[PDB]
Design a protein around this ligand. Structure first.
Ligand SMILES: Nc1nc2c(ncn2[C@@H]2O[C@H](COP(=O)(O)OP(=O)(O)O)[C@@H](O)[C@H]2O)c(=O)[nH]1
Ligand SMILES: [Mg+2]
Lengths: 37, 205, 292, 117, 105, 405
């Protein structure tokens, strides 16, 4: 398919401190139903 | 009619007539407006019995085209009134025995239309308030109407649907080979599946 | 104020049972349905209103245990405040348990040698009552000879089980080693004890119902703190049935259990039975902002 | 603004029917699976990124006091993109996204973390 | 777990007239037959409680009933679907276990 | 092509010694090739949020596909039994066709484990069980060898269970921009492919596919709704059998493409072009005047390049009619061979705005077609009228111009 479509849904910033892994920032807070459809 | 004649499979559905493609006898198990997408697993997990009520009835022309007429008149003898059995108990027992064979009690608009073109049709049966009951029952083979009054002379009129050119004689004999669980060779079936049918009972006796 | 607690042991040692009962509010009968912890399970639990506890419920099985001391050794054992090693007395591989503990102590000495080591001899309800304490001695001496070998001159141990109240004492003494400003709490508790003329004042935590401090630090039961903690956990679970939360409890006008703040519960046993309830309640309300 | 409408919003603690703790766990690989591609697929959901992990020393790359504490305590950062390519175009979309977006962005982030945190 | 005749269903419905019911109400017939009102419908709405009148289409679904299965063994059973599954593999690996799990649930 | 499997191994969660490789074929392949089951062991045996899902990740140069399964029952020790049938492929391939097979294998073995504990009891160890209330290696060998050799397997594991795998290629979904003015061709003979399982509509569409019938014409001829014909044509495109083309008229603007040199560089294109474009006999159409023995390949190449962007087929045919009469060339076949080989294309006509009284529906669809800038072909198809009548109707409706693109 030559039609451009960057099938992206979101980004996560996951850092691993010595107190355990954690998520600092994820941009789209929408659910799976809106994002996939 | 047991089938609808589609003109071509390549033509689409006309409006939303697919929802009208429902059995008449099992039409009352579905709700008035709830969509059919919910009652899918309920048919598998919890099968539904055949409802007591039926909401369809032949029109005026159908009773004058292919039907016949009979007449009963039943009243219990003085032997059964030695026990606590009046005419209402006989009517309840007769409706009970009309059922258990496939009969369905008719209440709705078409039955009232047929009754007027001949007062109150009944679905249940209460002996306390009412004292005269009239109710119809319907199977594809025949249609019964049972009427009663204070006189105790219970009247039953049965309209038998006449068979169409002996369909059970126009089909070839078909005897398959049946192997049950305890058998080891494919023996021959002892009944013709095609030529066994629910026979019309002699309701007078 | 982040405190990194490690909870290590062998397979089936009951680490997740302790974590569920003490913090996640599970009953003793509800720990049988627990599954096997895979790798390390992190739990961020808020203690008081300022402390946060990063509890690391480690796996305990052989592949995980061999993975801890080879590849993840630079991650699990750095910036560690308290290690809690859970020894099962039902284990038939006691020497392997001691060797695992020795490797853990070696890693902690290598990376964060300022930590505190605690050992809990769990499942000490299957053994008979006559041979419990001696068994707790018999292992502990050996563990001391292990614990002094890899640094760590001191090692505190507790005979624990989920079917009695010893778990509350063990976890209370483990947690209280991390609570800041303990001297100020002790001094304020002594001042309040002198002011109200109370026989004994004990300060808990509201959620976990663990003992934080006591006024004293007629002969009384030495294990009364853990028994009161268990009784209060049972009473909280009972009051959850009435669709509400426990607030106050007055026994014989002598024992007052009151919500001192949003993070502490006070248990005051006084001396005079003739004090009206409102005076004690008012003095409790005056000290509500003092301990904050 | 459509991502914050009432019919199109989810809690911050949940990412695609997964909690933040579990996502932060399984999007944080070991040392052997870091500093390379992390093409992870669960079910029509490709978690793709280039995790950057500290070396044996405290070096990120080779040539308020909570901020310095987190700088000295952090050992890995990962920028994870969630993709849903169709099954017939997986090997094209994932490859071009990794080649054109993720690699350069993560390398620049590693460089800027190495010089001035 | 009880055999009600068709006329028994008729009589039980006749006793449930001018009587209001609600969801999961365990009715009793002849002190041994147990019922369960698992659904009351009115104007397309599943109401929690309802009134049963003379024109209420009460249905009697059976939770313990006889079932017949007729499996067609044809040339198509060993054919493959578009995903890559045989049809009898779907029948013996996905249909029957799911229906038995649902029946037990 | 299908990628061969590199290593297949069966992993199980032991309640004492942890997750481990219970069986593996080929033997000592992971250790020899560098794959370590201490880095990704948390994905093979995961926490029950990733279970019953198709976990596919990348380890170095190897793409690892798995469907982990966790069963919850009090019979097993620690209330759980976790396993995984893990397949390893080289990274530079397409693991798409093997994914449904792996998913179905995991689901089938989960069903069997829930049914009669076929996998838990095969370990012959009572440590997997509560204790208070078939060879896997041969199966793995057979799966590996049969999927590498035959892309199929019918491996029996019991008296009623068999691992039954066939690997199908993945095909692209067809276009959605198929319309009523597109004629369908057929690169395959659709007569011999029809069997008893076809759709009833697709049976009727097949006789009316000859490279010159429009989809509306097929729908009216076979008494079919155009939507189902559209779906059937889409299904035929999905299998790479039917390719669309344009309606052939004598008012079209056919033009050479960038692949006209293929008429010289393909050694087998001109030779078929000589036989294709010629009438079987000396046809009468090659004897009508303009107004009142096979063709040379140079003649055909000169006739292909004579078309231009603006010269309609009528003007070109009346400008070259002695050549198409002496050589006995069918012009429709001449155009269709060029369109099939993609050496000439069609310049569509667009009526952009600037007689008998047609009915309200016809004028409504006329206005709707004009507002959407539809071609003359679609308007002619919808109104069932030729180009001249449509042009007269449009000029009656308003001023307009024709773009030949
Ligand atoms: N009888 C008894 N069982 C215990 C005790 N502590 C733990 N268990 C058992 O341990 C099992 C759960 O162990 P778990 O916490 O998952 O072990 P871990 O995964 O290594 O932390 C439960 O089934 C409990 O029955 C105890 O003191 N007494
Ligand atoms: Mg655990």
């Amino acid at each position: 398919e030559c039609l451009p479509n960057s099938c992206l849904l979101g980004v996560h910033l996951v850092i691993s401190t010595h107190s355990g892994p954690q998520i600092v920032y994820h941009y789209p807070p929408s659910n799976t139903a809106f994002l996939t459809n | 009619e047991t089938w609808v004649d589609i003109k071509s499979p390549s033509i689409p559905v006309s409006s939303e007539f697919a929802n009208e493609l429902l059995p008449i006898r099992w039409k009352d198990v579905w709700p008035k407006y709830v969509a059919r997408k919910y009652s899918k697993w309920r048919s598998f997990t919890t099968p539904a019995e055949l409802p007591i009520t039926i909401s369809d009835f032949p029109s005026k022309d159908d009773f004058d085209r292919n039907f016949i007429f009979r007449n009963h008149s039943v009243t219990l003898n003085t032997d059964q009134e030695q026990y606590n059995q009046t005419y209402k108990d006989l009517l309840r027992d007769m409706i009970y025995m009309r059922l258990l064979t496939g009969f369905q009690i008719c209440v709705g608009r078409q039955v009232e239309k047929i009754e007027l073109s001949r007062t109150v049709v009944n679905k249940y049966l209460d002996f306390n308030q009412n004292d005269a009951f009239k109710l119809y029952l319907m199977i594809d083979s025949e249609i019964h109407r049972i009427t009663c009054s204070s006189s105790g002379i219970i009247d039953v009129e049965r309209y038998l649907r006449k068979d169409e050119a002996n369909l059970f004689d126009q089909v070839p004999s078909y005897i398959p080979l049946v192997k049950t669980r305890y058998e080891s060779s494919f023996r021959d079936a002892m009944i013709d599946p095609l030529h066994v049918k629910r026979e019309s009972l002699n309701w007078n006796q | 104020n982040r405190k990194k607690l490690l909870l290590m042991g062998r397979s089936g040692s009951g680490k997740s049972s302790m974590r569920s009962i003490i913090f996640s509010n599970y009953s003793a009968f509800d720990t049988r349905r627990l599954g096997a912890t895979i790798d390390v399970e992190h739990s961020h639990l808020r203690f008081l209103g300022n402390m946060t506890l990063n509890l690391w419920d480690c796996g305990g099985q052989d592949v995980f245990m061999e993975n801890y001391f080879t590849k993840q050794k630079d991650h699990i054992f750095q910036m560690v405040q308290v290690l809690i090693h859970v020894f099962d007395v039902e284990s038939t591989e006691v020497l392997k348990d001691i060797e695992i503990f020795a490797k853990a102590l070696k890693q902690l000495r290598k990376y964060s040698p300022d930590a505190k080591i605690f050992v809990l001899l769990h499942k000490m309800d299957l053994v008979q009552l006559d041979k419990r304490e001696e068994l707790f001695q018999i292992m502990m001496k050996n563990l001391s000879e292990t614990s002094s070998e890899f640094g760590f001159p001191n090692l505190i141990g507790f005979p624990t089980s989920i079917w009695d109240e010893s778990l509350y004492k063990a976890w209370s003494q483990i947690v209280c080693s991390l609570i800041p400003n303990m001297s100020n709490h002790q001094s304020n508790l002594k001042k309040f004890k002198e002011i109200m003329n109370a026989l004994e004042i004990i300060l808990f935590e509201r959620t976990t119902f663990l003992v934080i401090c006591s006024s004293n630090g007629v002969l009384l039961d030495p294990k009364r703190f853990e028994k009161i903690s268990n009784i209060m956990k049972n009473f909280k679970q009972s009051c959850t049935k009435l669709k509400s939360g426990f607030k106050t409890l007055i026994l014989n006008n002598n024992i007052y259990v009151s919500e001192l703040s949003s993070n502490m519960v006070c248990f005051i046993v006084l001396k005079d039975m003739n004090i009206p309830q409102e005076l004690v309640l008012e003095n409790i309300k005056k000290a509500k902002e003092f301990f904050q | 603004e459509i991502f914050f409408e009432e019919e199109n919003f989810q809690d911050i603690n949940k990412i695609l029917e997964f909690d933040n703790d579990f996502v932060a766990e399984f999007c944080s690989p070991e040392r052997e699976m870091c500093n390379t591609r992390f093409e992870f697929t669960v079910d029509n959901f490709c978690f793709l990124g280039l995790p950057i992990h500290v070396d044996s020393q405290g070096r990120w790359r080779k040539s308020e006091r909570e901020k310095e504490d987190l700088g000295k305590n952090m050992n890995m950062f990962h920028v994870c993109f969630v993709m849903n390519p169709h099954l017939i175009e997986y090997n094209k979309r994932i490859d071009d996204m990794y080649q054109f977006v993720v690699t350069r962005l993560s390398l620049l982030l590693r460089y800027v973390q190495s010089k001035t945190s | 777990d009880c055999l009600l005749n068709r006329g028994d269903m008729w009589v039980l419905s006749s006793k449930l007239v001018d009587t209001c019911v609600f969801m999961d109400q365990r009715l009793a017939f002849l002190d041994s037959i147990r019922g369960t009102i698992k659904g009351i419908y009115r104007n397309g709405k599943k109401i929690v409680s309802g009134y049963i009148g003379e024109q209420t289409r009460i249905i009697f679904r059976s939770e313990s009933a006889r079932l017949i299965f007729l499996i067609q063994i044809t040339d198509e059973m060993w054919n493959f679907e578009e995903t890559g599954e045989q049809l009898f593999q779907k029948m013996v690996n996905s249909f029957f276990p799911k229906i038995f799990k649902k029946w037990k649930d | 092509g299908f990628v061969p499997i590199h290593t297949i191994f069966y992993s199980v969660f032991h309640p004492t010694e942890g997750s481990k490789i219970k069986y593996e074929f080929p033997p000592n392949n992971l250790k020899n090739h560098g794959i370590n089951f201490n880095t990704f062991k948390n994905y093979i045996i995961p926490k029950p949020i990733l279970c019953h899902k198709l976990i596919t990740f990348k380890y170095g140069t190897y793409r690892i596909v798995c469907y982990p399964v966790t069963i919850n029952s009090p019979i097993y020790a620690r209330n759980f039994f976790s396993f995984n049938f893990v397949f390893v492929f080289p990274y530079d391939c397409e693991t798409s066709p093997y994914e449904p097979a792996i998913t179905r294998l995991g689901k089938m073995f989960k069903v069997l484990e829930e049914q009669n504990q076929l996998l838990s009891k095969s370990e012959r160890d009572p440590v997997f069980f509560d204790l208070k209330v078939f060879s896997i290696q041969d199966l793995l060998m057979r799966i590996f060898q049969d999927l590498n050799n035959y892309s199929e397997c019918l491996i029996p594991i019991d008296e009623g269970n068999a691992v039954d795998i066939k690997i199908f290629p993945l095909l692209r979904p067809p276009t959605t921009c198929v319309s009523l003015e597109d004629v369908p061709l057929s690169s395959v003979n659709l007569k011999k492919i029809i069997d008893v399982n076809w759709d009833p509509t697709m049976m009727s569409i097949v006789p009316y596919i000859d490279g010159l019938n429009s989809i509306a014409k097929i729908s009216k001829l076979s008494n079919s709704d155009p939507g189902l014909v559209i779906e059937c044509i889409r299904h035929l495109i999905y299998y790479k059998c039917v390719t669309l083309s344009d309606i052939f008229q004598f008012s079209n603007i056919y033009a050479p493409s960038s692949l006209i040199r293929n008429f010289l560089t393909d050694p087998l294109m001109a030779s078929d072009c000589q036989s294709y474009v010629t009438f079987p006999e000396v046809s009468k159409i090659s004897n009508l005047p303009l107004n009142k023995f096979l063709p040379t390949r140079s003649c055909l190449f000169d006739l292909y390049r004579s078309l231009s962007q603006g010269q309609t087929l009528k003007t070109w045919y009346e400008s070259k009619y002695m050549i198409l009469k002496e050589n006995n060339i069918d012009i429709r076949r001449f155009i269709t061979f060029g369109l099939e080989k993609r050496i000439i294309y069609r310049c569509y006509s667009f009526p952009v705005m600037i007689m008998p009284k047609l009915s309200d529906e016809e004028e409504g669809i006329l206005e709707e077609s004009i507002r959407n800038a539809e071609t003359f072909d679609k308007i002619c198809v919808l109104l069932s009228k030729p180009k001249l009548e449509v042009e007269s109707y449009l000029n009656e409706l308003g001023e307009f111009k024709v773009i030949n693109s």
